[PDB]
């Protein structure tokens, strides 16, 4: 099993919220639009657990 994939894990030490996402991106990793979306995607996901559930959205 030798595929080209990447695992980006984003966790908040302030909220202690961990979030991992498997994304297979070669050069796209260097890409800002992709990296930004990834970083934001991860964060967006981390916050996703904050909003909707466990308390209603407010701060955000």
């Amino acid at each position: 099993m030798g595929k080209a994939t990447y695992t980006v894990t984003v966790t908040n030490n302030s909220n202690g919220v961990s979030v991992d996402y498997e994304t297979e991106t070669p050069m796209t990793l260097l890409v800002p639009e992709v990296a930004a979306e990834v970083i934001k995607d991860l964060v967006n996901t981390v916050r996703s657990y904050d909003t909707e559930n466990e308390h209603d959205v407010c701060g955000w």
Copy 2:
């Protein structure tokens, strides 16, 4: 114990290499220039181990 920080890990399932980075970026996480560098930096670091040279641009 109440600090604001984030843990972004980057592992290449293709090279089985992993790289973790602890950075404190609130809104920056959404920023592409920051995320791009964070994503590229992470990758650059992961690849850094692939290259004999272990000197990667990351503030100095």
